[PDB]
Amino acid sequence: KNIESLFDYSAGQFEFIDHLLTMGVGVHFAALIFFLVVSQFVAPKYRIATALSCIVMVSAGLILNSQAVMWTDAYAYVDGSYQLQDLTFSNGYRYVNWMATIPCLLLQLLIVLNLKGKELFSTATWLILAAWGMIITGYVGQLYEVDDIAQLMIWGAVSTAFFVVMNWIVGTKIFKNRATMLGGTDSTITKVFWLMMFAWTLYPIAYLVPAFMNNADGVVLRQLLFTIADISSKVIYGLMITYIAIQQSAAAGYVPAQQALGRI
Ligand SMILES: *C\C=C(C)/C=C/C=C(C)/C=C/C1=C(C)CCCC1(C)C
Ligand SMILES: CCCCCCCC/C=C\CCCCCCCC(=O)O
Ligand SMILES: CCCCCCCC/C=C\CCCCCCCC(=O)O
Ligand SMILES: [Cl-]
Numbered sequence: 017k018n019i020e021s022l023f024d025y026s027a028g029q030f031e032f033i034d035h036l037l038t039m040g041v042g043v044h045f046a047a048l049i050f051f052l053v054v055s056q057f058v059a060p061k062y063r064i065a066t067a068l069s070c071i072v073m074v075s076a077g078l079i080l081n082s083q084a085v086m087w088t089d090a091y092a093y094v095d096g097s098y099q100l101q102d103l104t105f106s107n108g109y110r111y112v113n114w115m116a117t118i119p120c121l122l123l124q125l126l127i128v129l130n131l132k133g134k135e136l137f138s139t140a141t142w143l144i145l146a147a148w149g150m151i152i153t154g155y156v157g158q159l160y161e162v163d164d165i166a167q168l169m170i171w172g173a174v175s176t177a178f179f180v181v182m183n184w185i186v187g188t189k190i191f192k193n194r195a196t197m198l199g200g201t202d203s204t205i206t207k208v209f210w211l212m213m214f215a216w217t218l219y220p221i222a223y224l225v226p227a228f229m230n231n232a233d234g235v236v237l238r239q240l241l242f243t244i245a246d247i248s249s250k251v252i253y254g255l256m257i258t259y260i261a262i263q264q265s266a267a268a269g270y271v272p273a274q275q276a277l278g279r280i
């Protein structure tokens with residue numbers, strides 16, 4: 017039901033997707049190690065944000081490594097190409113974790129914005145349903161990525177609508193709460209928001225890849241877009257949310273944050 021299943025692969029195409037995914041694993045688990053070690057410099061009121069990037073990290077990676085292994089399971093080298101065998105490879109599983117990981121990353125953004133209590137809980141609920149809305153219509157969407165390109169695109173459209181709207185909540189909260197942020201980070205947070213615009217927009221582009229390059233090289237460009245967008249949405253975004261928590265913690269008098277910064 018997916019375009020991955022339609023083609024045999026050259027050894028070059030096949031090895032590259034394997035390395036892409038394996039390199040993702042590497043990055044997401046090496047990153048996991050970092051937020052873990054620097055969590056001790058983050059003040060108690062921001063420490064969940066870093067914590068939540070650990071979880072993002074172990075969620076991508078788990079999925080990624082599983083995709084890696086389903087890739088070599090599904091295909092074998094037959095008559096000079098890599099050909100599909102008894103098992104299948106799908107990206108089905110990548111949408112499912114975005115059900116899981118997006119809240120996390122929206123939540124860690126909200127936490128560094130200094131949202132508290134009912135505005136935290138309420139913002140958090142709308143966004144989580146908003147992004148849930150986006151993922152699930154696109155998830156259904158890609159189900160017809162071979163059979164019925166009409167649905168992918170209408171399902172796409174329904175899902176972008178969800179994207180636009182979630183994007184709007186987010187940025188309202190970012191520029192609404194900009195002034196609350198300590199230690200320079202009101203400038204930083206606006207770079208965060210644009211980074212999100214960039215990375216998030218790469219996934220729907222992977223989404224459309226079938227309608228505009230339905231062939232084995234589009235399969236490869238899809239996984240390329242995913243790695244870029246995952247690295248950008250998950251890890252680097254993580255990196256940047258952490259910088260913001262450390263700096264606010266030290267601006268707010270958390271001495272191990274003042275010592276970690278001053279130590280560099
Ligand atoms: C790992 C983190 C993130 C933020 C993944 C985000 C995924 C999207 C922004 C996907 C958006 C899509 C849309 C808008 C339309 C077609 C189907 C998608 C869900 C891929
Ligand atoms: C900021 C995100 C960076 C993500 C790193 C991704 C690594 C990709 C780097 C170089 C791509 C060029 C490699 C050539 C593709 C070979 C094509 C083929 O085998 O058919
Ligand atoms: C194992 C798969 C192939 C990759 C090999 C792993 C080599 C790791 C290279 C960097 C991974 C990205 C994590 C970036 C470091 C975070 C610490 C920091 O700079 O703040
Ligand atoms: Cl605190």
Ligand SMILES: [Cl-]
Nearest residue numbers: 075076113117
């Ligand atoms: Cl994820």
